[PDB]
RNA sequence: AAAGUUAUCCAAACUCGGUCGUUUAGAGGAAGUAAAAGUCGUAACAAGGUCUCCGUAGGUGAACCUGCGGAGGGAUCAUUU
RNA sequence: GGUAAUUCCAGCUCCAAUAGCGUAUAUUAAAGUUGUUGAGGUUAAAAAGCUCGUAGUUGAACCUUGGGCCUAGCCCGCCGGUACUGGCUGGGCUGGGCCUUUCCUUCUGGAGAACCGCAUGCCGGUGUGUCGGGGAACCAGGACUUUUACUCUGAACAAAUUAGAUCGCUUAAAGAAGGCCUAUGCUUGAAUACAUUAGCAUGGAAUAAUAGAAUAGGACGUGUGGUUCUAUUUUGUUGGUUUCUAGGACCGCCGUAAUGAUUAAUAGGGACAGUCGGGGGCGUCAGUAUUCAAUUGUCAGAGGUGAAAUUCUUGGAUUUAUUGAAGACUAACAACUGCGAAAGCAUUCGCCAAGGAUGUUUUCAUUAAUCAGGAACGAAAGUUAGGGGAUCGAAGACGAUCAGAUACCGUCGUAGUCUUAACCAUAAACUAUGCCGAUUAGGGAUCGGACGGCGUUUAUUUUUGACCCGUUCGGCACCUUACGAUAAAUCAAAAUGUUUGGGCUCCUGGGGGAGUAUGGUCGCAAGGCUGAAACUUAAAGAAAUUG
RNA sequence: GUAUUGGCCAGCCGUGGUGACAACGGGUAACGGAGGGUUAGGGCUCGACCCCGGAGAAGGAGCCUGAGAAACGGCUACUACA
RNA sequence: GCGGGUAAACGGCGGGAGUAACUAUGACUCUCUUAAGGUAGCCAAAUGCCUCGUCAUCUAAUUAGUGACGCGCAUGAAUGG
RNA sequence: AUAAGGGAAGUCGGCAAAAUAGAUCCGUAACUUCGGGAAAAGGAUUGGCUCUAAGGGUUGGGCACGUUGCGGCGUGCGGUUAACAACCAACUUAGAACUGGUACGGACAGGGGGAAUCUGACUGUCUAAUUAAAACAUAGCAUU
């Protein structure tokens, strides 16, 4: 309650909606284009990088395990990020200097599960695909 | 309620339904008009011209007896005041506040009243200008306003 | 201040009927008010009404007989074409079989069904069912 | 009637300086978030053991304490000639 | 998931979609979590401390209604007959004509009807004719008509696409094709609607604005005078000159006419009358108390605490009576009481300007509501200069307490507390509840004004004033109740909201980072106003129930 | 001067024009439109891309021929490449 | 002489040991000690002996210059900061 | 007084010398006690000759009567020259063409500038004959 209701008050109603529309969080990040600027990916879906080292990450408080992430430097803009290698016993497939391909967890810029500070996962290694190697459908090229 | 207040009084006057003079008046409309002009020449404004007629002798409504309002009668006889009386009294009150205010410099309450009175004068003066009673160049100058009242 | 005399009349009628009373008083009376009552009367939703004549504006005393659910007013009198008149009856009418939407047109004010017969449109001012 | 030549106009390009925008190195200084089986106290929640909180000013290892004016979200809807 | 894992790694079995199915990013629905339709703002996120006011948005009622006849077009009911046909004194719906004081502008021309008689011809009607009294309607042309918005119908405007009609590409997404006996032939389709804002025409005349006669500078007339400009053809032809006539502009005299002004809003402003209040400013008067000082009497302790100590004391403390000075503050009366825009305001009297309500057969006539920026006032503390400095007392110094005690308790004490002249602009500045207007239920108290009434009281006494009973307008509040509202506590508004639209301004969108960084602006400073991002998280929070 | 109008340009003379009904400036991961996707109604979002209009041929400027070009599968010069 | 007041009067304003899930450091604690134990600020400064102190910047190379750090032989608040 | 190429490599140290300089028009930062900084920094123009434009002063104004040696007054009025005509006079400012061995404040006269630290606030005063400074004085503030 409290809106202008007259028949010649179309200017006030249009201006008010434009101003209060910024309080939304989804729209504010769309208008300012934070993904184009701040995200390690240039607003894209995937990216390629080079593996630097293998790192183990502890799970959060209720859980207890080592999450076995990996460090990668992006070819496109030289930024450095960390990515998680899924499935059981898959670090044996990623060596040093291996040209991996990454994607997101699907939470749209937030950490997923108990893994802290990790936003990406390995999809392909040496252009073969991680899951295909796991089920022994292919052999990793030398 | 009120223009500058929070009161909501309803005190007013009730006009009778009848539009004809009482049978005991026995006074002609011509006699009334001559009676009005004598009081106007003595100096009275239309406000207490009516109350003198009502209280002292006879006429309760001048309109029903003669068919015209008091101010309309005076204008046709060349007796209308140069400025309307309602605006005249507002000017008179504003002058008295300024005269008192300059002697009592830190009377902060009377300073607030003066803003209300002058703000009421500007609104009323704008209406008279857009209807043609006052010339379009008329302005309320605080410096020379003291001559208008007296 | 008083900005819609029609709203005051319709609101006062709705309150008294909802409380089960039989008669209503309306302080200001106008041409639009009387023309609105006449449309309701011809459909049986109210009874006789009488206009006392004070010299200022007059009053109205309407006689109620039940049968009335609600009577409201649309405050911004929008402009409605003839082709889009079916949008409104879908919005503020309980059912298609009964109910009336009041319009104002150059051929006098009328309900939404007679306007279709005369093939006329105009501005919307209220409703009752 | 060709080469050549005199004076204006349209003007690319280079040099120096000014101004605006984006990106980036830096001794040292001062904050935030998280992770801890760390050290010292116990401010708040019961009248939390000095009732709690707000604006302002000063002081102390740390939470905090004290002065002046407010609020009850209080521990009182209440005391008679 | 920590030794019998319905959730990991595997073998069986089973479920979902199926030539397809999973994952990542973007975008729409779900979202009434962006809310014009349609969203919250007492306590969950959120009404500016308060009032004035310009843009902007919004604004009370009122001017030709009704009635009386005639006639048409489309439906339904009914009757009867064979979907057809006729009828109802059929009841309705849409439209067109007349009389009621109203009806419908005007001139020129075109062609020509109806109603009329003239004579000429058949079985009381008719072609009659370059017959005339006569122009219903129609077409073309000229002049006049308050101006916008709105709605109806037309005109103009792209193919593809969207909706949609037709035809068995073997069906379908498509396509614009096809069909008929057999044909040396015939025949058809390639429709229609929508856009929609702006511009061009037409009909309507409700709703919302706008214009006209008040210093008459007003309307009308074949009334009647003027002075100025323009000049068609007729008197052979040209030039020059004149009259009459026709037209335009302007100004008198006279006449005609019902000669020209809407109410006075339980909207607003102003005047007047008797009052009311701790509303504001300047000056002045009074009260006890606290501290100090002087005089006076007496003799051993006084102070302070839960208990003690620091401190003061025969250089007579504490206590007792009388007198004097200084600064601050206004006890009891004092309340579910008064006034102010809020902050706030309490001893007497004099002076100065202002305000609300009530009373009124005064006056003006829409002058009004709310307000982005902008402006006045704004407790306490704090700042700059003088005066003042009794009492309390931030900082500070000591005495106890305590494991420690930079505190709570006790004895001292600087800025400050008060005033004059200038700055600051924040408070749990609270009713955590914006302002104007209408309607909805019962009750008894109280403050201010008016009106009615039986008595008591009382005065150089009546009328007035004090008390009692009732009505009414305007205020600060309260009790009961729920037809209603809410998540609930609870609320006469927080009601009249899924049956949702009376007008207007401001503010909010999960919790942190954060009212922080940075830029700008105001200030002597302290600081005020405006106000992000990176990063991080699955819960914070509200009302109530049992322990 | 131009195919022609025009502060398009040269002389002389006035002091104006736009703005809270948002001028001026900055951003655009911006060619515009017919239209695509998603739907109770109201909407939100996308449109380089077969049709229509505009602009460009590595970056800037100049010009010849001709009814028509400031053309680049035409010419001249500088800058950058080769 | 005994007893009070006074620092914008002259002037003054400290040492030694232990102690935090590596190392380092020491918020915290005991201890000696008096008129009081240097507070807000500032610094190899015209005031620092060791000293050409340590780190950064300026140069091909800098005992010099500027910016930081501070147990400061012997900085410091009207002997005014 | 002048010097090829280099431009502080000289020296305790840019000591001495050089460079800048008038007027007209553009342009001008951090900081700030909002007065300043500022002539900040950094650019352009300048002769001769032949012309054009602007900026002023003084005296003159139509009838009708009356006086007087073509007129000076007395008057009685009217009009506002859509500002005309004659004569007189110094300098200051702006613009155009042509011209030259590209020169022109042609001699004289005539500021070098910028980024920072230490120290006294400023103008002012003193060791005549080796020290002009951070020393003295000053307004403001405080005490007796
Ligand atoms: Mg959201
Ligand atoms: Mg009212
Ligand atoms: Mg108001
Ligand atoms: Mg008001
Ligand atoms: Mg940086
Ligand atoms: Mg660092
Ligand atoms: Mg506490
Ligand atoms: Mg508490
Ligand atoms: Mg509580
Ligand atoms: Mg086992
Ligand atoms: Mg097992
Ligand atoms: Mg098992
Ligand atoms: Mg909500
Ligand atoms: Mg809240
Ligand atoms: Mg409030
Ligand atoms: Mg109205
Ligand atoms: Mg098809
Ligand atoms: Mg129309
Ligand atoms: Mg009234
Ligand atoms: Mg008073
Ligand atoms: Mg004392
Ligand atoms: Mg004694
Ligand atoms: Mg006193
Ligand atoms: Mg009282
Ligand atoms: Mg008292
Ligand atoms: Mg405002
Ligand atoms: Mg104060
Ligand atoms: Mg104070
Ligand atoms: Mg002084
Ligand atoms: Mg003072
Ligand atoms: Mg004390
Ligand atoms: Mg203390
Ligand atoms: Mg606030
Ligand atoms: Mg508040
Ligand atoms: Mg009640
Ligand atoms: Mg009672
Ligand atoms: Mg009373
Ligand atoms: Mg009485
Ligand atoms: Mg009452
Ligand atoms: Mg009250
Ligand atoms: Mg709905
Ligand atoms: Mg800030
Ligand atoms: Mg969890
Ligand atoms: Mg709770
Ligand atoms: Mg203007
Ligand atoms: Mg676009
Ligand atoms: Mg682009
Ligand atoms: Mg396109
Ligand atoms: Mg692109
Ligand atoms: Mg494609
Ligand atoms: Mg290319
Ligand atoms: Mg050709
Ligand atoms: Mg081209
Ligand atoms: Mg080209
Ligand atoms: Mg090519
Ligand atoms: Mg080509
Ligand atoms: Mg240790
Ligand atoms: Mg120190
Ligand atoms: Mg040092
Ligand atoms: Mg050094
Ligand atoms: Mg040195
Ligand atoms: Mg220094
Ligand atoms: Mg040294
Ligand atoms: Mg060095
Ligand atoms: Mg050197
Ligand atoms: Mg240094
Ligand atoms: Mg010392
Ligand atoms: Mg010292
Ligand atoms: Mg010293
Ligand atoms: Mg040389
Ligand atoms: Mg040389
Ligand atoms: Mg050189
Ligand atoms: Mg050297
Ligand atoms: Mg030297
Ligand atoms: Mg020299
Ligand atoms: Mg020289
Ligand atoms: Mg200056
Ligand atoms: Mg200058
Ligand atoms: Mg210069
Ligand atoms: Mg300088
Ligand atoms: Mg020259
Ligand atoms: Mg020069
Ligand atoms: Mg020179
Ligand atoms: Mg000096
Ligand atoms: Mg000497
Ligand atoms: Mg000397």
Q: Which nucleotide is nearest to A33 (CA to C1')?
A: F29
Reduce the DSSP state of residue B127 to 3 states and report it.
helix
Touching B: which chains, 3+ CB pairs < 8 A?
C
Q: Kindly provide the resolution of this structure in angstroms, with one decimal.
A: 2.9
Q: Judge whether B121 and B88 are in contact, CB under 8 Å.
A: no
Closest Cα partner for B3 from B75, B90, B82, B110? Answer: B90
Method of elucidation:
cryo-EM
Beta bridge partners of C101: C127
CA distance C122 to chain A (A): 16
How does DSSP classify residue A60? -
CA-to-CA separations, B7 to B2, B11, B109, in angstroms, rounded? 6, 11, 19
**Residue C50 and residue C34: Cα distance in Å, rounded?**
10
Q: Judge whether A99 and A48 are in contact, CB under 8 Å.
A: yes
**Residues of chain C positioned with their CB less than 8 A from the CB of A7:** 76-78
Q: Does C3 touch chain A (CB under 8 A)?
A: no
Q: Judge whether A94 and A85 are in contact, CB under 8 Å.
A: yes
Listed in sequence order, the residues at least 6 apart from A69 whose beta carbon sits closer than 8 Å to its beta carbon are A55, A56, A57, A82, A83, A84, A85, A115, A118
Q: Does B14 touch chain C (CB under 8 A)?
A: no
Tell me how far the alpha carbon of residue C13 is from its chain's centroid.
11
DSSP C28-89: ---HHHHHHHHHHHHTTSS--EEEE--SSS-EEEEE--S----EEE-SS--EE-STTHHHHH
**Residues of chain A positioned with their CB less than 8 A from the CB of C76:** 5-7
Q: Does B24 touch chain C (CB under 8 A)?
A: no
| Residue A54: exposure state from Cβ atoms within 10 A (0-12, 13-18, ≥19) | middle
Q: Judge whether B140 and B129 are in contact, CB under 8 Å.
A: no
Closest Cα partner for B87 from B127, B44, B136, B144? Answer: B127
Residues with CB under 5 A from ligand 1 (ion): A 26
Quote the tokens at residue B149.
């009242």
The alpha carbon of A140 and the centre of ligand 52 are apart by a number of angstroms equal to 69
**Residue A59 and residue A98: Cα distance in Å, rounded?**
26
The alpha carbon of C39 and the centre of ligand 60 are apart by a number of angstroms equal to 104
Q: Judge whether C75 and C93 are in contact, CB under 8 Å.
A: no
**Does residue A26 lie within 7 Å of nucleic acid chain D, judged by its CB?**
no
**Residue B100 and residue A89: Cα distance in Å, rounded?**
96
Spanning CA of B58 to C1' of E461, the rounded length in angstroms is: 38
Contacts of B36-43 with CB under 8 Å at 24 or more apart are B36/B62, B36/B70, B36/B73, B36/B74, B37/B74, B37/B77, B37/B79, B40/B74, B40/B77, B40/B79, B41/B79
Torsional sign, CA B59, B64, B68, B71? positive
Nucleic strand D contacts from chain A, 78-117, CB < 7 Å: 116
């Amino acid at each position: 309650g409290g809106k202008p209701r007259g028949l010649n008050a179309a200017r006030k109603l249009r201006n008010n909606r434009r101003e209060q529309r910024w309080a939304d969080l989804q729209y504010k990040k769309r208008a300012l284009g934070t993904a184009y600027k701040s995200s390690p990916f240039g607003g894209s879906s995937h990216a390629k990088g080079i593996v630097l080292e293998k790192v183990g990450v502890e799970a959060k408080q209720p859980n207890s395990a080592i999450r076995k992430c990996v460090r990668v430097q992006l070819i496109k803009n030289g930024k450095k990020v960390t990515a998680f290698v899924p499935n059981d016993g898959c670090l044996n497939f990623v060596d040093e200097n291996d040209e991996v391909l990454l994607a997101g967890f699907g939470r749209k810029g937030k950490a997923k599960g108990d893994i802290p500070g990790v936003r990406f996962k390995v999809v392909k290694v040496s252009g073969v695909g991680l899951l295909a190697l796991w089920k022994e459908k292919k052999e990793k090229p030398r | 309620g009120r223009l500058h207040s929070k009161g909501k009084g309803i005190s007013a006057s009730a006009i009778p339904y009848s539009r004809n003079p009482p049978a005991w008046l026995k006074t002609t409309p011509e006699q009334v008009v001559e009676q009005i002009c004598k009081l106007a020449r003595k100096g009275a404004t239309p406000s207490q011209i009516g109350v003198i007629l009502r209280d002292s002798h006879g006429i309760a409504q001048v309109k029903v007896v003669t068919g015209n309002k008091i101010l309309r009668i005076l204008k046709s006889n060349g007796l209308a005041p140069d400025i309307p009386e309602d605006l005249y009294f507002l000017i008179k009150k504003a002058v008295a506040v300024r005269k008192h205010l300059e002697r009592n410099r830190k009377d902060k309450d009377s300073k607030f009243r003066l803003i209300l009175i002058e703000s009421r004068i500007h609104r009323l003066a704008r209406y008279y200008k857009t209807v043609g009673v006052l010339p379009p160049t008329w302005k309320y100058e605080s410096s020379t306003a003291s001559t208008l009242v007296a | 201040v008083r900005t819609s005399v029609l709203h005051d009349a319709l609101n006062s009628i709705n309150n008294a009927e909802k409380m089960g009373k039989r008669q209503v008083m309306i302080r200001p009376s106008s041409k639009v008010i009387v023309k609105f009552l006449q449309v309701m009367q011809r459909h049986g939703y109210i009874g006789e009404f009488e206009e006392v004549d004070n010299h200022r504006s007059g009053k109205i005393v309407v006689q109620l007989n039940g049968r009335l659910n609600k009577c409201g007013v649309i405050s911004p009198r929008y402009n409605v074409r003839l082709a889009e008149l079916e949008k409104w009856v879908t919005k503020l009418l309980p059912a298609r079989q009964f109910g009336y939407v009041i319009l104002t047109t150059s051929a006098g004010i009328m309900d939404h069904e007679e306007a279709r017969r005369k093939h006329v449109a105009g501005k919307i001012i209220g409703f009752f069912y």
